[PDB]
């Protein structure tokens, strides 16, 4: 039950079925690709009060492996509801990728994961006001939409899948600096797992939540008081002054598990880490249960 | 008029009254401040189909000049509707700053611009499930909200103002590479103008719009066919193959003007620029008219 | 030969045998690895008036794949003279990696490429003033050097090879902006080639030189006036207003050839590029001659 | 004395007269300026085994405040020996700024600080092989050097001053993570002090040194074993598990004093810091003796 002297709690992450898209953004450079990505995946940490859960999947797609031969970056966007996801593909590609210097948007759902199809390009194509043209680029059906820069290229349809949302683990540490050094290291690890993304700022949740509110009636979620170090009768080990949660969404359960696995291993290499836990709902809500003890 | 041999079109930018907040994010470092900022100001280029218009104002606030003595970054968030703006202050601070490692949120509306108040901190404080405390930090009324990291510090209320939204200018260039080298240079200039921000990806709009559609009944906006270089149907000078728009929102008209002014100057120093224009609605819609000829 | 409408001159790059080292830098995060790496590889464009030629090879080495299980980046350092190379290893590891927060230095010269060994770790260990300690980390012989931060971990020996310096190609474009947009795409592509690096700023040479000088007997090298657009008597196509050179060094000839290949391909997808060429010295001096037509 | 609960040792930093140059690098964007700057200032932590001590002074010089109206960043380069300094100016401007896309080099040594001149531009201009033009740019004497990109603009002469090298303080923390969190905050603060730079990686020395060596006659510096947490006989408080040094060089004593001041204050706001100290050589060698208590 230890990884590098760090206790691994015998518990599980409780994750959920969720609708996800996966989008390849290319641009003139990695720099401009990331400009579009950040804007497009921003305001998207959690569907508690964001319109989606979004983030970067692969930060560097080689020019030679993109449809247009340009630098690319894959992102994922998810939602529990499929239509809100479709609305969110339109909004973020339409408002944040279409408007971003030089950037184009292609589907990047693997064929194996494809379940539904959304014609985002087509719906976006009407922006060209009669002047939009369909074409074929590297075997893809795309729309060339006239814009002041020149043209916006967007694939006709995007693959939608049922993914796994809310995979997670907690880093419990001797202090805030130590928990954050460990959490950034975990996230550096999760970066390399294809099919997985971490929607929170830097991948990291500094304010994990519990379903609903004890004192109040109107709140959907509230602080996880059990793991809050400034709260007097909390459920934290001795020597733990800071908790961080890494939350992971993925194309499938195996990607989420891999992300959790390599995330925890990386964290446990950084000093001042006391214990690794995970957040669940007692199996009463999720569709998935990733037991930390099974990953190693 | 010419600036460095670049024709300055004798026209105007038509800007609007808009509700704006201005928020100081501090964090343990400039790095983590920016992690929170990007997430919080992302998906926020335009209210056509984003929930807000958001972006960075001052990217470096010295530790010495913040309430808590930590590295800070000011951002602005705006909307035409004040209540959607209040909802957006809650949503972005609550979901993207509260959850971001180490980051705190303070008001940064100058007293001169303050018109309304919104008690975002207080409304956020209920997340603490009875465990939230009020306090005074550097003469500010804050809420210390217990979170797994330790505490989230957020100011009680945030100043809301009526700002100027939609200031702008177009860079018309001999090519796309040249228009973008000029636009990034403009944006580097606009960065230094306090009270102003550029909500589009990199500050830059590659797909400027017009009100409505000539062809379709279901479009709030569509592409500006008049300034589209591939639309062989258009109002662009000869030698112009690419157009970029820089759109600027500010606390007041004088900030938007200063941003426009130093933006155009910086653009006109970069090669391949043919003409500087601006977008308006014939004075039939806006509340402001910034004549390019008056700035110089 | 044409690539995306871009002419590929039937010429060759002429490259040279050069002594080379390759180093894996790990650290608590990719941020701090990059801090050490940028410092260790800067002032390292050319052996003309720099002390070495140095640059990043692989920018993200996953935590799982490093000896200490931490985020890594590999860099390469080269010199035509082996003695000077060993001194540059010691200087750059000792002054830039040892001194950098959390960074360790491990050997990353492939076994196939190794010809000689340089006991940089052993030579650095004397900094410990008696308190240094030899140890095994992951089957590697390292020195644990006590430092005020804690420890500096450095592998005992680093493998040196005879690699290839001076692979190149020129990008000839309609404008400076177009040239640099193409060149950066090139570099993003080259980034992804393992065992190759581009030592110049951003990978790119804004000021390629020719051997000797037409006016100054005392100068060994001067501006390549043949490719200078502002010289009236240049050998440039009409319509070429900018030339950039990409220079590539690598562990072997194949890595350099691969870098030129993917770099050229990437450049030719960017708008405003007229011609791709390459530099040589008549095929007489160099040990390697890489004909552009043989790449595609 | 205490700052936010952190003890401030009643000791002093002992600093030295050092020759210094200050250079304004402009380029087509802040991005490209930073590319040139990072290359020009790298391999420049300490004159112990680097060829200079170099670093960024001001990271964001607005377009309107530069001679060419482009984005700027200032850097400082220093050496204890003036002749080696002039050589490092020529080497780093010539190999790292001249070669870097879009970058120009202008003098940024304040008039008040100027003692001597170094005609770096004049010396570089011979690269133009007869095609170089002297010219005036906003009242400055520059050389327009033809290069394959277009032109390299470099000011004829650069001002040298006798500045201050070696200002410092130590951060003594409860852990490495806490030490480095405090140290980075420090550096963000120091970033904002004009005329001061921190030459080490990220501004930070993970491996502070002392004059000479106990065991080894060939070493001019070796580990500061008294502040090594893993050295059995150390002079560290119990409860100090990590020490970092911040080393500051500047144009004058005030800039260095100011940097130490704002840097210390910033550090002490970060959690897990026990003590702030500083390094000196008894007050016998150095020309400046900066007492920490005199700062606050
Ligand atoms: N996983 C990690 C994590 C933690 C956090 C952190 O998020 C939060 C979450 C909540 C605060 C509360 C502060 N603001 C408040 O006073 C208003 C609350 C509330 N108003 C609403 O009633 C809408 C509720 C909505 N769902 C509902 O429609 C049904 C559930 C409730 C019902 O009975 O109808 C929802 O899912 O959020 C809101 O939604 O803000 C701050 C930060 C983010 O991600
Ligand atoms: N300051 C610059 C700026 C510019 C921008 C850019 O903003 C915009 C503004 C508008 C857009 C276009 C979005 N397109 C849509 O609304 C389609 C709705 C709808 N599409 C359809 O399916 C049409 C169906 C159909 N009609 C019928 O036949 C029945 C048909 O096939 O013809 C759908 O999604 O369901 C993109 C970006 C932002 O900021
Ligand atoms: O083609 C690939 N190329 C790539 C490439 C091009 C370059 C550019 O390199 C150089 C090469 C040579 C210069 C120096 C030019 N001027 C002199 O040095 C005179 C200084 C001086 N003499 C006088 O007093 C006058 C002295 O004694 O130093 C600068 C930069 C680098 O890499
Ligand atoms: O406090 C501020 N200061 C910070 C600071 C610390 C440092 C770090 O500097 C140094 C200084 C000295 C070393 C040790 C170098 N060792 C050798 O020289 C061995 C010579 C060798 N002989 C044999 O041992 C075999 C041979 O033949 O090459 C490493 C790093 C820089 O700046
Ligand atoms: K676009
Ligand atoms: K699936
Ligand atoms: K990933
Ligand atoms: K996100
Ligand atoms: K302070
Ligand atoms: K926070
Ligand atoms: K106002
Ligand atoms: K601004
Ligand atoms: K934005
Ligand atoms: K180190
Ligand atoms: K080899
Ligand atoms: K590479
Ligand atoms: K380099
Ligand atoms: K500074
Ligand atoms: K240059
Ligand atoms: K001075
Ligand atoms: K440096």
Swiss-Prot record, chains A, B, C, D:
Pathway given in the UniProt record: One-carbon metabolism; methanogenesis from CO(2); 5,10-methenyl-5,6,7,8-tetrahydromethanopterin from CO(2): step 2/3
Localization terms from the record: Cytoplasm
Broadest EC class assigned to this enzyme: transferase
Keyword Transferase: yes
Temperature optimum or stability note: Optimum temperature is 90 degrees Celsius.
Highest taxon in the source lineage: Archaea
Job of this protein: Catalyzes the reversible transfer of a formyl group from formylmethanofuran (formyl-MFR) to tetrahydromethanopterin (H(4)MPT) to produce 5-formyl tetrahydromethanopterin (5-formyl-H(4)MPT) and methanofuran (MFR). Acts via a ternary-complex mechanism. Uses N-furfurylformamide much less efficiently, does not use N-methylformamide or formamide. Protein overexpressed in E.coli has very similar properties to enzyme purified from M.kandleri.
Record's subunit section: Homotetramer composed of two dimers. Dimerization is sufficient for enzyme activity, but tetramerization is required for high thermostability.
Family per similarity comment: Belongs to the FTR family.
Protein name: Formylmethanofuran--tetrahydromethanopterin formyltransferase
Species of provenance: Methanopyrus kandleri (strain AV19 / DSM 6324 / JCM 9639 / NBRC 100938)
Lineage: Archaea, Methanobacteriati, Methanobacteriota, Methanomada group, Methanopyri
Gene that this sequence comes from: ftr
């Amino acid at each position: 039950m230890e990884i590098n002297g760090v206790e691994i709690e015998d518990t599980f992450a409780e994750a959920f079925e969720a609708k996800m898209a996966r989008v390849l953004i290319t641009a003139a450079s990695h720099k401009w690709a990331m400009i579009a990505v950040k804007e497009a995946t921003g305001f998207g940490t959690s569907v508690i009060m964001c319109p989606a859960e979004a983030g970067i999947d692969c930060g560097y797609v080689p020019p030679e492996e993109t449809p247009d031969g340009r630098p690319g970056v894959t992102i994922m966007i998810g939602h529990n509801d499929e239509d809100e996801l479709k609305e969110q593909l339109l909004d973020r590609i339409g408002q944040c990728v279409m408007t971003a210097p030089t950037a184009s948007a292609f589907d990047a759902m693997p064929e194996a994961e494809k379940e539904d199809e959304d014609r985002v390009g087509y719906k976006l194509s009407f922006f060209g006001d009669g002047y939009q043209e369909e074409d074929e680029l590297d075997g893809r059906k795309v729309w060339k939409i006239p814009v002041v820069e020149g043209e916006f290229i967007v694939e006709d349809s995007f693959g939608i899948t049922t993914g796994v949302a809310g995979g997670n683990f907690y880093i419990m540490a001797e202090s805030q600096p130590a928990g954050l050094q460990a959490a950034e290291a975990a996230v550096d690890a999760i970066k390399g797992v294809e099919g997985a993304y971490a929607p929170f700022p830097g991948g990291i949740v500094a304010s994990a939540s519990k379903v609903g509110s004890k004192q109040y009636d109107f709140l959907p979620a509230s602080t996880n008081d059990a793991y809050c170090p400034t709260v007097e009768d909390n459920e934290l080990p001795e020597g733990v002054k800071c908790v961080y949660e890494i939350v992971i969404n993925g194309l499938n359960e195996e990607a989420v598990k891999e992300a959790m696995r390599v995330g925890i291993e990386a964290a446990c290499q950084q000093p001042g880490v006391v214990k690794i836990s995970a957040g669940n709902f007692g199996g009463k809500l999720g569709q998935y249960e990733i037991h930390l003890h099974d990953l190693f």
